[PDB]
């Protein structure tokens with residue numbers, strides 16, 4: 001059954017991929033080669049070109065991503081050669097550096113060796129490569145609540161956070177054959193952070209907010225033609241609402257709207273004053289302003305929706321079905337000011353794609 | 363088949379209704395009575411208590427409605443006795459008056475005679491009883507674009523609008539046996555309107571915006587125990603976003619955000635300034651302020667979400683399944699500041715309910 005699942009996904013993927021790459025005449029032979037390899041080895045190995053295009057297809061198929069216009073410019077780093085924890089560590093450092101690119105962020109993915117018998121070669125514990133720790137003890141809340149479980153796991157392993165609201169979590173990952181993960185502090189010189197200021201309201205700096213430059217999701221599985229790349233961190237650049245409307249605003253995250261209201265000089269007493277809405281708009285303005293001022297790439301939700309409209313058009317022109325998850329594509333502020341809110345999307349799963357996987361902590 | 367559909371819906375409805383009304387021992391006999399009535403007449407007639415509770419259940423089952431906490435306080439007006447166009451007209455005038463209640467809006471439904479062989483007794487053309495006309499000629503756009511088709515239909519029938527941006531459409535409805543609908547101007551003394559001002563920005567009145575007090579959807583079918591009440595106008599009070607974030611803001615409606623930006627003293631040149639978002643917040647503040655100042659009932663989206671949370675709790679406590687359409691329940695501004703955005707809802711259709719029906723114009 002497992003070989004058949006693999007073989008069927010392989011046929012589907014190779015046909016589509018080679019069709020897109022102008023290589024339809026190479027399909028029959030490549031399929032034959034793959035068939036023998038599966039019989040004899042239990043699996044098969046992608047060519048560099050298959051791996052690159054597969055990672056690109058997987059982004060293009062990601063229903064929850066508004067950023068997909070740029071799917072074909074993904075920089076794919078092939079690290080199927082790594083065997084040691086030092087090499088994994090250095091690959092992850094290099095990903096941060098090359099993706100950051102001094103603020104002119106480059107969409108990048110680093111692909112590590114795939115699972116074999118469902119057996120992981122490298123298992124990355126981080127949710128993102130750069131993320132802030134979170135703590136909750138005797139009612140006292142510090143940092144990012146969404147990080148509490150991973151932070152506790154790290155502190156079981158000998159790491160200790162300074163208990164600032166913005167402690168960088170170490171890289172933490174496990175190698176096949178090791179019972180425990182290892183962890184490494186991130187060099188601060190690798191990590192760009194942006195202090196949050198407002199274009200008009202001087203006092204906004206009194207909040208002492210900041211965020212990191214680059215979101216690098218590091219715990220999703222890339223599936224390509226039946227091969228499971230459980231370790232394949234990727235990044236683009238942020239849409240400003242991710243930071244301003246969710247990370248800094250959610251009651252279960254940094255929960256800053258009351259403090260924002262106070263610094264922008266409005267009362268936070270009556271729902272009818274729409275003070276949360278007003279605070280959200282000013283916080284989201286501050287985020288965009290701050291990243292721009294610092295020369296770190298970011299997109300606003302209006303521009304991002306416009307680009308996504310072009311992605312829809314490009315799909316139709318290419319004769320490809322569009323898939324999307326309306327509930328994630330709408331921005332969390334002024335969604336009805338975008339075209340996305342006014343149409344529907346087919347939420348079917350097409351592969352290659354990126355998938356959730358169970359967290360080894362928790 | 364049709365009698366069987368009716369009989370099956372009838373059994374389901376009468377059991378549930380009588381169960382909710384403490385009348386479970388009356389079910390068997392009432393079902394027997396209904397069975398004979400269907401055999402002999404082709405249909406059956408609700409008791410006053412069935413009709414009232416059915417209209418209430420239908421609101422409670424309305425997946426797209428955030429306002430459902432108050433389902434049990436609906437004022438049900440039974441107008442199954444009407445036979446003439448004068449009586450329909452007067453019932454609709456009376457609905458407006460009693461629902462408005464000098465601004466202290468009363469949730470009301472007026473139920474007209476049901477369809478017989480799928481044959482409508484009264485067919486109401488209005489989308490809402492109070493609504494503004496819309497015109498589009500040689501590129502020139504006036505009033506509410508969403509009303510263009512109904513406005514044109516009315517002008518085919520001898521009505522003429524003044525071509526203000528806020529012309530009240532006449533009541534327009536057709537009686538069984540008539541080829542054409544009749545229309546009646548609304549008496550202005552029946553219709554409360556609210557001018558839009560802002561609590562702090564004097565110039566906001568320069569926009570000369572207004573809206574009507576009471577939304578009275580008049581083109582949905584109420585289905586209760588297999589009986590089709592195609593003509594059953596209902597109302598609550600507005601949630602402010604309906605007016606501020608959609609009716610006055612949508613590009614395909616009144617399209618006021620650029621004018622709002624200009625009066626509140628902000629540039630509308632760069633997406634990154636989030637000027638649309640800022641304009642939306644100030645317009646929505648103005649709407650709530652204006653209705654409150656005038657003593658006309660309205661709810662903000664934060665309060666409405668809080669009430670809806672209580673509705674969820676009340677359903678679970680009563681042992682009733684909750685249904686909802688997440689995509690309509692989230693408010694169109696700051697949706698992630700509400701609990702609704704952070705959970706999911708079962709979008710199954712439960713009857714009694716309110717349904718769309720085909721428009722006789724168009």
Ligand code: HEM
Pocket residue numbers: 055059062064065066067068070074107108109234235236237238239242299304328354
């Ligand atoms: C180039 C700029 C990019 C932008 C502006 C962008 C924007 C977004 C946004 C706003 C989300 C929603 C995230 C949330 O609410 O937590 C998202 C989700 C996602 N994006 Fe992108 N994205 C970009 C690049 C990428 C890249 C390079 C990949 C993969 C190669 C990717 C794959 C995804 C996936 C898989 C999700 C779903 C994450 C989840 O379910 O938690 N995107 N994108």
Ligand code: HEM
Pocket residue numbers: 417421424426427428429430432436469470471596597598599600601604661666690716
């Ligand atoms: C008491 C105050 C009420 C509030 C604040 C409220 C709020 C809302 C809102 C905001 C919507 C979405 C409308 C849109 O986006 O166009 C809605 C839809 C709806 N409401 Fe309510 N509502 C209330 C009362 C009622 C009543 C009395 C009924 C029926 C008896 C009702 C039945 C519905 C239905 C059927 C829809 C769906 C309309 C459509 O699909 O176009 N609600 N409600």
Ligand SMILES: C[C@H](O)[C@H](O)[C@H]1CNc2nc(N)[nH]c(=O)c2N1
Pocket residue numbers: 341342343344689690691
């Ligand atoms: C097709 C698309 O889902 C559509 O724009 C919906 C979305 N959610 C909505 N929600 C509400 N309350 N009202 C609406 O008109 C809409 N429009």
Ligand SMILES: C[C@H](O)[C@H](O)[C@H]1CNc2nc(N)[nH]c(=O)c2N1
Pocket residue numbers: 327328329703704705706
């Ligand atoms: C369960 C519920 O649908 C959930 O809050 C979703 C809604 N839409 C979202 N959309 C985005 N982009 N990101 C999110 O975290 C969420 N959360």
Ligand SMILES: N=C(NCCC[C@@H](N)C(=O)O)N[N+](=O)[O-]
Pocket residue numbers: 215216217234235236237238239242243247
């Ligand atoms: N933009 C991207 N978003 C995924 C980020 C999680 C995020 N919402 C947060 O950290 O706020 N990905 N990306 O660019 O690959």
Ligand SMILES: N=C(NCCC[C@@H](N)C(=O)O)N[N+](=O)[O-]
Pocket residue numbers: 577578579596597598599600601604605609
């Ligand atoms: N609140 C209610 N909403 C239905 C209104 C249509 C509306 N969005 C508009 O006219 O803006 N109904 N209600 O209260 O019965």
